């Protein structure tokens, strides 16, 4: 670990990598150090709940096959592209180094320095906090003791992919708690594995259907049927009361009286932004939405920026906000990098989200998407190209935010408009690809729409 580094990136995920790339692009000789608590070099997360499950050496290499059959590495860059932390301070033309297995435990804003868990002290000139978040657990699990806890997976990293993939091959029943996109993706991934093995997969949540807090009743229900068609036993309207061990089996007790016996549990119930450094750093966090509060240029302080899942930014349309989008991590990380190199540009990007439940069904979302808001959905029969696989064959990539582009324009599918009076504040696209720029334009203009069935023609 160097005693000093010009650019210090705390956390080694998607946002940090984007910032590292941006800093180097604007400053060819920049010296950038990434401190990552995890043992792995920077990698993208979407494949962990998708393509990596649709394949035995893949678990070792982590080089997956996209829906189009072509391989891609989960890592942002090959390990030989990074320089050693030891050489970073004076190596010719600089570079980007990564300190894996090390965690920043103290931040001293006034002295521009951080302390690592091993006692190491590092000063910086410009710092980016890109710590992401920590998965949330169920209070029922927290209050159940060590045994139950040891048999519950909080899905987020490469290590969770490997341990869960192992378990799916070794046990007879796995239960997923959570109806969100991630829980549903895992449900489909695990369901397919179970079909060949002849095992069981259960998914339960308090809502009436999958993604119930986001999707309107019609599409929420359609999604639940989709998951059931994969062999998964889906249990909606399920409120967990307690969880314990009975005769070596996990026993989940629900409020309506139902009891569920299973071998392992996977929880996908949201995340808690990692703002532990706010304590010693004396930085302000948002008690309502979570995360480090930053200004328009993503600054927490004159020389400290925040990007990705850990940032509570000011959405140009919605006010204080925090999101969990790959697109956001990439764009905000890139911007932070540019601002750390004298750009002084505001974050006005409208972050998009995407989810693939296999090669045949996908979703895209943007803006305020809440099922409690008044909505208007327009649907139609899907064509042969309206699916994630075709979209990937066309674009050559499975990372939707890449093929969709970051710009704004100048039944088996459909569009769902979320409204505020007659203005569209959010949009969900079901099996419609390469039209996000149109969605961004509609939301940005913020005009009132007398029809919408006319607007749907745009998609
Ligand atoms: C399984 C899965 C699937 C997903 N699929 C999609 C998808 O299809 N579409 C989409 O739009 N989004 C998706 N997302 C979400 C998207 O991946 C995230 O928004 C993005 O990864 C966040 O990046 P980040 O850099 O902000 O944080 P992270 O990638 O979470 O990483 C933060 C890093 O910093 C480390 N760290 C934390 N604290 C410290 C510390 N004190 N010192 C050192 N290191 C620290 C962490 O351990 C971690 O390595 C998915 C997420 C998961 C988990």
Swiss-Prot record:
Annotated consequence of substituting residue 369 to M: In DFNX5; uncertain significance
Species name: Homo sapiens (Human)
Reaction(s) catalysed by this chain's protein: A + NADH + H(+) = AH2 + NAD(+)
Function per UniProt: Functions both as NADH oxidoreductase and as regulator of apoptosis. In response to apoptotic stimuli, it is released from the mitochondrion intermembrane space into the cytosol and to the nucleus, where it functions as a proapoptotic factor in a caspase-independent pathway. Release into the cytoplasm is mediated upon binding to poly-ADP-ribose chains. The soluble form (AIFsol) found in the nucleus induces 'parthanatos' i.e. caspase-independent fragmentation of chromosomal DNA. Binds to DNA in a sequence-independent manner.
Outcome, altering residue 442 to M: In DFNX5; uncertain significance
Region (FAD-dependent oxidoreductase): 7-354
The protein, known as: Apoptosis-inducing factor 1, mitochondrial
Tissue expression: Expressed in all tested tissues. Detected in muscle and skin fibroblasts (at protein level). Expressed in osteoblasts (at protein level).
Record has Cell inner membrane as a keyword: no
Consequence recorded when altering residue 67 to A: Increases protein dimerization at lower NADH levels
GO function terms (MF aspect): DNA binding; FAD binding; NAD(P)H oxidase H2O2-forming activity; NADH dehydrogenase activity; oxidoreductase activity, acting on NAD(P)H; poly-ADP-D-ribose binding; protein dimerization activity
Impact when changing residue 325 to A: Allows dimerization in absence of NADH
A Gene Ontology biological process term: cellular response to nitric oxide
Binding sites annotated in the UniProt record for NAD(+) 2: 67, 364, 434
Outcome of swapping residue 106 to H: In SEMDHL; severe decrease of protein expression
Modification sites for N6-acetyllysine: 259, 444
Impact noted for substituting residue 356 to A: Increases protein dimerization at lower NADH levels
UniProt-listed Enzyme Commission number(s): 1.6.99.-
Shown stretch of the complete protein: 128 to 608 of 613
């Amino acid at each position: 670990a160097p005693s000093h580094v010009p650019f210090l990136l705390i956390g080694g995920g998607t946002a940090a990598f984007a910032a590292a790339r941006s800093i180097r692009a604007r400053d060819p000789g920049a010296r950038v150090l990434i401190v990552s608590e995890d043992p792995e070099l920077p990698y993208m997360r979407p494949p962990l709940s998708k393509e990596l499950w649709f394949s035995p050496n893949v678990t070792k290499t982590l080089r997956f096959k996209q829906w189009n059959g072509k391989e891609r590495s989960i890592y942002f860059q090959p390990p030989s592209f990074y320089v050693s932390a030891q050489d970073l301070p004076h190596i010719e033309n600089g570079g980007v180094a990564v300190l894996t297995g090390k965690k920043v435990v103290q931040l001293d804003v006034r002295d521009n320095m951080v302390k690592l868990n091993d006692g190491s002290q590092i000063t910086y000139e410009k710092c980016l906090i890109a710590t992401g978040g920590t998965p949330r657990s169920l209070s029922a699990i927290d209050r159940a003791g060590a045994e139950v806890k040891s048999r519950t997976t909080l899905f987020r990293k490469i290590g969770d992919f490997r341990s869960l993939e192992k378990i799916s091959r070794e046990v007879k029943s796995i239960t997923i708690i959570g109806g969100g996109f991630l829980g549903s993706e895992l449900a489909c991934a695990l369901g397919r594995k179970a079909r060949a093995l002849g095992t069981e997969v259960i998914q339960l949540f308090p809502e009436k259907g999958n993604m119930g807090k986001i999707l309107p009743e019609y599409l929420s229900n359609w999604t639940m049927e989709k998951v059931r068609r994969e062999g998964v036993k889906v249990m909606p309207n399920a409120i967990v009361q307690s969880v314990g061990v009975s005769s070596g089996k996990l026993l989940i007790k629900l409020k309506d009286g139902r009891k569920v016996e299973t071998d392992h549990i996977v929880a996908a119930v949201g995340l808690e932004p990692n703002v532990e450094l706010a304590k010693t750093g004396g930085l302000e966090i948002d008690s309502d939405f979570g995360g480090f509060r930053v200004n328009a240029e993503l600054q927490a302080r004159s020389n400290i920026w925040v990007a990705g899942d850990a940032a509570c930014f000011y959405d140009i349309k919605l006010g204080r906000r925090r999101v969990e989008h790959h697109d956001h991590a990439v764009v905000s990380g890139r911007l932070a990098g540019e601002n750390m190199t004298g750009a002084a540009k505001p974050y006005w990007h409208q972050s998009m989200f995407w989810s693939d439940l296999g090669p045949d069904v996908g979703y895209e979302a943007i803006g305020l998407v809440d099922s409690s808001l008044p909505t208007v959905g327009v649907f139609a029969k899907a064509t042969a190209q309206d699916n994630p696989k075709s979209a990937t064959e066309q674009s050559g990539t499975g990372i939707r935010s890449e093929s969709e582009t970051e710009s704004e324009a100048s039944y088996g599918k459909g569009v769902i408009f979320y409204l505020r009076d007659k203005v569209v504040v959010g949009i969900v696209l079901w099996n419609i690809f390469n039209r996000m720029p149109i969605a961004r334009k509609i939301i940005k203009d913020g005009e009132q729409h007398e029809d919408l069935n006319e607007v749907a023609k745009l998609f």
